[PDB]
Structure formats: structure tokens, C-alpha cells
Amino acid sequence: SHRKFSAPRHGSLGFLPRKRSSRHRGKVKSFPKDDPSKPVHLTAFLGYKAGMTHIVREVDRPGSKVNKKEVVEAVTIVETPPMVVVGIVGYVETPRGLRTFKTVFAEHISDECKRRFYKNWHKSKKKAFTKYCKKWQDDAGKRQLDKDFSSMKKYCQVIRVLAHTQMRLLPLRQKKAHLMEIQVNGGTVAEKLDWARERLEQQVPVSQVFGQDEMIDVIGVTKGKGYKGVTSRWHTKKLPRKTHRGLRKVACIGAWHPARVAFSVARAGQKGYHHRTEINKKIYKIGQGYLIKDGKLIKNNASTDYDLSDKSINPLGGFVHYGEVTNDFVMLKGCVVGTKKRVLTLRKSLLVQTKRRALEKIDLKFIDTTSKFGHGRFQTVEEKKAFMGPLKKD
Amino acid sequence: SGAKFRISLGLPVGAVINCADNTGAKNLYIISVKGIKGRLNRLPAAGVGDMVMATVKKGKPELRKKVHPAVVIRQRKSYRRKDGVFLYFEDNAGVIVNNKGEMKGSAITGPVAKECADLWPRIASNAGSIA
Amino acid sequence: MKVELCSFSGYKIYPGHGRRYARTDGKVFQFLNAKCESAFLSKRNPRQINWTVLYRRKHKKGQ
Amino acid sequence: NEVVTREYTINIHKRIHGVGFKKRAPRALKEIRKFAMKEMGTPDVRIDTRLNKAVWAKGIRNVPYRIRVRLSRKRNEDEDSPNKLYTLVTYVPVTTFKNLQTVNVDE
RNA sequence: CCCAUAUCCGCAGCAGGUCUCCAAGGUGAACAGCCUCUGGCAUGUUGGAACAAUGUAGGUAAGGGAAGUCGGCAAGCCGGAUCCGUAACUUCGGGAUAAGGAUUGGCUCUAAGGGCUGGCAGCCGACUUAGAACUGGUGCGGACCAGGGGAAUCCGACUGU
RNA sequence: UGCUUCUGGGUCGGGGUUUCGUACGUAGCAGAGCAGCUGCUGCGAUCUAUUGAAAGUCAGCCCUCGACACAAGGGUUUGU
Ligand SMILES: [Mg+2]
Ligand SMILES: [Mg+2]
Ligand SMILES: [Mg+2]
Ligand SMILES: [Mg+2]
Ligand SMILES: [Mg+2]
Ligand SMILES: [Mg+2]
Ligand SMILES: [Mg+2]
Ligand SMILES: [Mg+2]
Ligand SMILES: [Mg+2]
Ligand SMILES: [Mg+2]
Ligand SMILES: [Mg+2]
Ligand SMILES: [Mg+2]
Ligand SMILES: [Mg+2]
Ligand SMILES: [Mg+2]
Ligand SMILES: [Mg+2]
Ligand SMILES: [Mg+2]
Ligand SMILES: [Mg+2]
């Protein structure tokens, strides 16, 4: 018989199977559709989740209760040191979908990128690309490379670069670099390859890919939580306390007929560590990394036009469980997937952004740099020492 | 024109709150909440600025044994604002109103939340202070 | 946004920190954390708690 | 330099972090023995009884946070043993653990 | 000789059953519970490593406060002692710890409450009670021990089986 | 994920951060009082100073490059 009272089903069957992601690095399933009238540009980037803070800003939203008023907004800091372009891969449109056509690699590849090609770097002789590299060094091989580039100009429809991360600048234990294909959108195919060929072994800062107040998508793997029951995994109602044989369950997992458990019934299993793509995460700030200028370390990348204190984005004691963000960073409104240290894929929007919230301009008045290791109450050590005064340690 | 934002709801159905006016009612017993569609097993809940339907359990006999429209003006559950402030009050209070939102009494005891004052100008005019 | 001072400990509260308390008698207080809030609500006098600003002033510790 | 003596501070606190009350001291011994094997590379580790007493001096759960120990690698006199060196771990009573380093001890 | 979480009966070294004697210190009203000495034991027919779900057994939860459910089931509240105070009804015995309040630590004192020898003098002593000052971040029956209450209806007087 | 570029991680130490809330000892003509000796000496909860002190703090916090040793290894397989 029909269920007595209506209620929506728990969870989305659109995110099935709730399994562990086969990839640790977020995959770009769709790149923005190419518009041959725009200048050649990149459409994605790699960053690492450093941590979260909050900011103060004055909203500009006519007809709103917060128009011309200051609000506190949570933000995510993603450390995004420049990537290095190491190869070009071409694709040909076929009646079976895109097919990889031709991959070229730069003459030089750093050891960070080469570590990606090995399962045991310690035990390896580091022979990767040691014979491929000799093609750039001789006339015969060079004459074959440009032929490969010419072939890519004739036949390929999609061009992507092979950029990797620079792990020697991050504070993480990991030294193996994250290597991903980024699609080159913009002008003709020939202009794409000319653009890409000039950038082999070059560095690309995040500021060349994204801009202030831009709405982007963050792709990554969520925090893993292991084996979870239906109550936690699917958020079903707890059964009464009197239930025999457990109450963190789903009471009926199907009707007599069909004489089977359906794919749409809540079951126990893996929770978290799922691949996810989240859209419309506004960029609040593209921060500059530390610089040594005239023998002075310039690091006041957390100062605003209204707060002139010489402080960096790092909170007192550093980012908990991450380290110190001394590279360029992107400040994203709200939360993103992953743990601290998780590699996040930044991607340009697949939509047309014509909305006041999408077109609003962000003017940060304050960035909170208090310690996150406790209930921190000082923005800077100078501020703390001035309040406390001398101590016994002194 | 400016719509109120979501706030934490601290008063489900069955909450007995103080009556902070001079009607004669001492406390208000919430039997429902305006605008709640809800879902299975979820109790309708109310926060500052919300109009609810209530009965008087303690107070003048003429006010008892019938359903009044009321508005919550203070709540003990702390709710966030857009400036990041978490405000809560020492007690849960309301005032009896009519469907138009104008008070049945004339005076309010204690402060009145800014969230409710902006929404109900008739309650706002009677508020001794605003929080 | 102006910085409040904790009604108990005298420390200053930056935006998006602590809570605000409004009593039925119309007084409004700001608390840095639940530690300061708990001491105030248990009617502890801040002038006797060694780590507050009112204690150190009374005892001339900074001076 | 097969025969050598060194003094260490072992942070027992981070070794047994999160262990159940009834397994805390028994695991400190296992962590000391594990520590001694790592430093001296000697599977035959003999913990002095006084060191056993120090680890248990506060019961099964309120184990000392830090403990100073001496690791003496000595030759084994048992020709029947498969190990030719053994490590002896002795307790070192210290008043303070501040600034204590890893030092060589020469006899 | 065992005399019972292994010598007896339950098919067994079975969490069951099976008659007795002796019986320390502390706290406390106490053969209560909690800690210890004499005496005894090795965790109860195995260990190691992990710390997922679901369990079993314990806890804690903002705001609300029975809206849950057949039903407050379960849990929770109360709880010792001193001082005050105590209704309907009643078979005048009760009801009654009705209900409802206040107090409670530590430290330093004050007063009172006795015996023996020869309205006094001296010499001995046993724990109690009351009062006061001071004192701590209002914490104080600090663990343990330890009644939720009220208004009614039905049935059976009660204790007992 | 890491496992020699005078380099690497690790251990201990140091610093930052942060939690609680002011350590032991010592001194005090601070302390309600009481006791003994002719103002002193004892007992005394507590108070004050030393003293935002002491203690803990990655085990899944942040930075050291101070001390210590270790690190160039081992096993099983795989061929158009
Ligand atoms: Mg239906
Ligand atoms: Mg049952
Ligand atoms: Mg934190
Ligand atoms: Mg229901
Ligand atoms: Mg056991
Ligand atoms: Mg055993
Ligand atoms: Mg047995
Ligand atoms: Mg058993
Ligand atoms: Mg609750
Ligand atoms: Mg509560
Ligand atoms: Mg009901
Ligand atoms: Mg129901
Ligand atoms: Mg019950
Ligand atoms: Mg009665
Ligand atoms: Mg009758
Ligand atoms: Mg009977
Ligand atoms: Mg019989």
C-alpha cells in the first residue's frame, strides 16, 4: 500500500556510486567551450588548500539590507605557485569522440615532474625522457619535432598544455609534482600552438589565468571518512531507542516484489573521498607571494587599503596542519572540498556570468590573521607584545 | 523592500515564552508558526521577527483558552548576523498582535531584537530599546 | 567595523569573534569567548581573575 | 665503536598518545624497546629493571611525559646467541628536561 | 584433602545451585559504598595489531521541553544531615521525609555538658552541642552513600500468598 | 606520500602558537585569633611579592638547521 505521509527521498541518486575516487587529483571533465575570437588563454590551474579565514568588506547590493554595510565572510586560501609548462598534447575530433593525436614534451623536465613518472623514485635510475630529450639536440630530431607541430596544426582541433606544480616551494612533505593537462582556449589552432610552443619550460602565474572578482569552479576530492552507516552516509531517520538489533539502520530495504534490493536504497559503505565539482566560487583576492626587495622581505599580502599593518596571510602559528603560505594565493569565498594540503583544480566558469552577485566587485576592508590553533585574539605578534608587555622569557 | 535573512530558529512548537507587553498575558505557548511548510517529523520553529500562533497559559482569564497571533521579539538561542555577530538574549519573549501586525498592548518590557523591529514597525515604535 | 572590548576580560574583540549578550534590563555585553562568557554568567568578579585587564590594573601589574 | 654509550630524552608523551588507560605503561616499554632498536640497531634490547620501575612509578595510565635514558651497546658473551651486540637501557634521574641534548658518554 | 567462579550437583575446571564458624584501620548512623593492613590472587578455557560500520555497556549535549510513543518506556530530576514549615482528608492512630524554604567547606576561637583526692583547692578525661571571627573565583552531604512531587478515578482494607 | 646536491628525512632541543590561570621554595610589622617568655618567639586557613607564573602543547599544530646518530641497503618478479 502507499506510504502514509509523503517525504522526499534522502540523498541524490545523481552522485552514485558513493565509492572512493579513482583519482586523487580532481579531473576537469569539461573545459570551457572554445571561442576562436578571444585571445589565447588557459582555462584551469592547480592549487593547494591552505586553510580558511574570514574577511570584512562593505557590500554593494542596491535594495538589500546589507547595502553600504560591512559583513564578515568566510574564505578559503589556496596556495597557487606558478606552474611550469612541459608539454603539448593534441586532440582530433572523431566520430567516436576526441582522440589523443600527438604529445610533445619540452627538452628539459625538472625532477619534480619526473618524480610523477615513478612509483619508487629512490630505487629508480631516473631514466625518464633521457632518450626523448636527445631529439631537441640534433638537427635530424629537430626536423621531426617541427613536423609533429606542423601535423598538429593540420589535424588537431583541441590543444592542451602539460603543466605541473612546483612542490619545492610548498611546505608539504610531498616532492612529487602534480601534472595535468590544461586546455588552451582562444584563437586559431595555429595560434594555440605558437602560444604553447613559446611557453615550454616557462612558468605561468595564477594571475595570468584568473582575475579579481571572477567566478570559478573548484574541482577536487572531498574529505574521506571511511566506512559509514546509513544514518551518517545517507541521513536517514534514527529508529526508536527500543529497536532490537540496532537503530542506526534503514528499517525496510524494499518491498517483497521486486524480489531484490534496489540500487536506490540506502546502504552502508564508503563516505567521503568523492570526486566533486563545485561552481560559482568567487575570487576575493589574488595574493602576491613573498619577495625580497632591496634586502627586505616584502610579505604584507594580507594588508588592505583600510588596514596598513605589515602582515602576511599566514595566521599566528601558521596554517594549522598545513604550514606557511609564502607563494601566490587565491582567496575563494566560502568553502571548498578536500582536506588541508589537498590539491584543488581551479577552472574557469562554463556559464555566462551576468548576475549582480556574479558581477559584484570585492573590496576587502580586513583579513583576520589570528591564530587558528586556538581561540586566537591577536592579529599580529607586534600587536600581542604591545598588549602583554615584557614577559619572563625576555 | 529589503528582505530579512535566515536566522537560527530557537523556538519549536510547544515553546512557552514570556509575554513582554501589557496585555495581561504572562507567557505565550506556541502552537504553530506562520509561513512554515515543513516536512515529515519536523516541528515548525520560530525566531525573532516571526509571527506565530500562541495561547496564553498564565494571564488574564479573558486572554486564556483562545489562539492569538504573536511575534517573537527576543530569543535565548544565539543567531548570526551578516556582520558576524552572534547575539542572544537572556530570555524568550513575544508580544500579542493581530493579523496586520499591530500590537494588542501598548508597552514592551525589555529590549527588542533589531531583526523583529525592522520587520514590524508597530512593534518597533513601542520598543524601549533595540538590540 | 569597530572593535569591542570583552565585558569580562577587557580584551578587544575583532569582527567575527565572540558573542553578544543582551540582558532583559537593557544592558548589552560582548564576550571574547565562552571562557569569558562563563565567568561573567557565574557572577565572578573580573577584578579577582588574574588574567583579566581589570585585575592587572587593580594590582598595578603592568605598571 | 661497536661498544658505545649515549644519553637520550624520549618523549614518551607523543609515543603513547591516544592509548587506552590499561595499555599506557605497557606500551611505553614497547616504545622504549622500539626506540632502542632504532638508535642502536640492535635487536637484543635489555631494559633495566630500574627503568621499568620509573615507567610504572605513576601507575598504568599516568605515565611520565619524558624520560632520560642511557643506551649502552655492549658485546654479548653468550656464544649461543644469534646477536653479537645487545643494547642496555638504563634510567637516568634528572630534575629538569629543559635543554637536554643527545650526548656521548665515554667510560 | 576439597568444601566451591577447578576436588560436591547441574553431561564440563558450567557467570547456576549448595548448611555453617572467626572477622582489622580510615570515612561514615552503619556488617552501606570507597580506600588500606593481615592473608590471598593473576583478570577468570588464549595472545598480538588496529580503532571502520552495526552492536552491547557507560557518558555529555546549544535552543526547545513529551511536540516522541499505545502509554514519559527509557533516562533524567529529588536525595544525607541541621533549622524552619507543612494542607485536604481521616477509622484521630495517620496522611508526613506531605508540600515548601534556608543552611552545610577550611581555619582560629568562645561557652556548656564530668570523674577522683583532700558552695573550695588540686589532679585527671570523653566525645559532643551551640555560638563567633576570618577565609576561598558561591565552592563546600564536593567522591561514595542517598525518596521527584501534587490533584484525582477504579479495584482490593491492610501485612501475607 | 618520503628514503645523500654538504644533501635527506628522523630524534632531542630551541622558538612561534595555544590551553589553564599565577608553580615549589623563599620573604612579608598582611592574616581572624590563640600559646609561651618579657616587645619577642611559636601555631595559624588564607593573602601579597617573586610570578600572565608553572605545566602541557603533535602524537595528524607551524619554523628551525643547534645536538645525535642514521641514510648509498634487502627480498620477489617481469621481454616485443
Ligand atoms: Mg502518495
Ligand atoms: Mg525489545
Ligand atoms: Mg581552531
Ligand atoms: Mg512522525
Ligand atoms: Mg579483563
Ligand atoms: Mg591472562
Ligand atoms: Mg574458571
Ligand atoms: Mg569468558
Ligand atoms: Mg538539550
Ligand atoms: Mg540548556
Ligand atoms: Mg502526544
Ligand atoms: Mg504522533
Ligand atoms: Mg521509569
Ligand atoms: Mg500526599
Ligand atoms: Mg466513586
Ligand atoms: Mg491486596
Ligand atoms: Mg505456599
UniProtKB/Swiss-Prot annotation, chain A:
Feature: compositional bias, Basic residues: 17-30
Signal peptide: none
GO molecular function: RNA binding; structural constituent of ribosome
Gene Ontology annotations for the cellular component aspect, listed alphabetically: cytosolic large ribosomal subunit; nucleolus
Cysteine pairings via disulfide bonds: none
Cross-link (Glycyl lysine isopeptide (Lys-Gly) (interchain with G-Cter in SUMO1)): K293
PROSITE patterns: RIBOSOMAL_L3
Region feature (Disordered): 1-36
Modified residues (Phosphoserine): S12, S303
Principal location listed in the UniProt entry: nucleus
InterPro entries linked to this entry: L3_arc_euk, Ribosomal_L3_dom_3_arc_sf, Ribosomal_uL3, Ribosomal_uL3_CS, Transl_B-barrel_sf
Subcellular location: Nucleus, Nucleolus; Cytoplasm
Post-translational modification: Constitutively monomethylated at His-244 by METTL18. Methylation at His-244 regulates translation elongation by slowing ribosome traversal on tyrosine codons: slower elongation provides enough time for proper folding of synthesized proteins and prevents cellular aggregation of tyrosine-rich proteins. It is not required for incorporation of RPL3 into ribosomes.
Sites bearing Tele-methylhistidine, chain numbering: H244
Residues with the N6-acetyllysine modification: K135, K285, K293, K365, K372
One Gene Ontology biological process: translation
Domain of life: Eukaryota
Record-listed cross-link Glycyl lysine isopeptide (Lys-Gly) (interchain with G-Cter in SUMO2), residues: K38, K223, K225, K285, K365, K385, K392
Family classification: Belongs to the universal ribosomal protein uL3 family.
Reported function: Component of the large ribosomal subunit. The ribosome is a large ribonucleoprotein complex responsible for the synthesis of proteins in the cell.
Subunit structure: Component of the large ribosomal subunit. Interacts with DHX33.
Name of this protein: Large ribosomal subunit protein uL3
From Swiss-Prot, chain B:
Phosphoserine modifications at: S8
Entry-linked SMART domains: Ribosomal_L14
PROSITE patterns per the UniProt record, alphabetical: RIBOSOMAL_L14 (PS00049)
Cleavable signal peptide: none
Compartments where located: Cytoplasm
GO terms for MF: large ribosomal subunit rRNA binding; structural constituent of ribosome
UniProt main location, coarse: cytoplasm
UniProtKB keywords: Cytoplasm, Phosphoprotein, Ribonucleoprotein, Ribosomal protein
GO cellular component terms listed in the entry, alphabetical order: cytosolic large ribosomal subunit
Cited Gene3D superfamilies: Ribosomal protein L14 (2.40.150.20)
Alphabetical list of InterPro entries matching this protein: Ribosomal_uL14 (IPR000218), Ribosomal_uL14_CS (IPR019972), Ribosomal_uL14_sf (IPR036853)
Biological process according to GO: translation
Positions of post-translational Phosphotyrosine modification: Y29
HAMAP family per the UniProt record, alphabetical: Ribosomal_uL14
Function (record text): Component of the large ribosomal subunit. The ribosome is a large ribonucleoprotein complex responsible for the synthesis of proteins in the cell.
Known partners and oligomeric status: Component of the large ribosomal subunit.
Family: Belongs to the universal ribosomal protein uL14 family.
Record-given protein name: Large ribosomal subunit protein uL14
Native species: Oryctolagus cuniculus
Curated annotation (Swiss-Prot), chain C:
Subcellular location: Cytoplasm
PTMs per UniProt: Mono-ADP-ribosylation at Glu-4 by PARP16 inhibits polysome assembly and mRNA loading, thereby inhibiting protein translation.
Similarity comment text for this entry: Belongs to the eukaryotic ribosomal protein eL24 family.
Residues with ADP-ribosyl glutamic acid modification: E4
Protein name: Large ribosomal subunit protein eL24
Residues of the full protein shown: 1 to 63 of 157
Quaternary structure (record): Component of the large ribosomal subunit.
Highest taxon above the source species: Eukaryota
N6-acetyllysine: residues bearing it: K27
Cross-link for Glycyl lysine isopeptide (Lys-Gly) (interchain with G-Cter in SUMO2), residue positions: K2, K27, K35
Gene name of the record: RPL24
UniProt function note: Component of the large ribosomal subunit. The ribosome is a large ribonucleoprotein complex responsible for the synthesis of proteins in the cell.
UniProtKB/Swiss-Prot annotation, chain D:
Gene3D superfamilies xref list: 3.10.440.10
Phosphoserine modification, residue list: S81
Residues modified to N6-succinyllysine: K38, K53, K58
GO CC term, one of those recorded: cytosolic large ribosomal subunit
Coarse class of the protein's main subcellular location: cytoplasm
Keywords (A to Z) from UniProt: Acetylation, Cytoplasm, Phosphoprotein, Ribonucleoprotein, Ribosomal protein
N6-acetyllysine: modified positions: K58
Compartment(s): Cytoplasm
GO biological process: cytoplasmic translation
GO MF term set: structural constituent of ribosome
Family annotation (Pfam families): Ribosomal_L31e (PF01198)
The family this protein is said to belong to: Belongs to the eukaryotic ribosomal protein eL31 family.
Subunit structure: Component of the large ribosomal subunit.
Role of this protein: Component of the large ribosomal subunit. The ribosome is a large ribonucleoprotein complex responsible for the synthesis of proteins in the cell.
Protein name (record): Large ribosomal subunit protein eL31
Source organism: Oryctolagus cuniculus
Lineage: Eukaryota, Metazoa, Chordata, Craniata, Vertebrata
Gene: RPL31
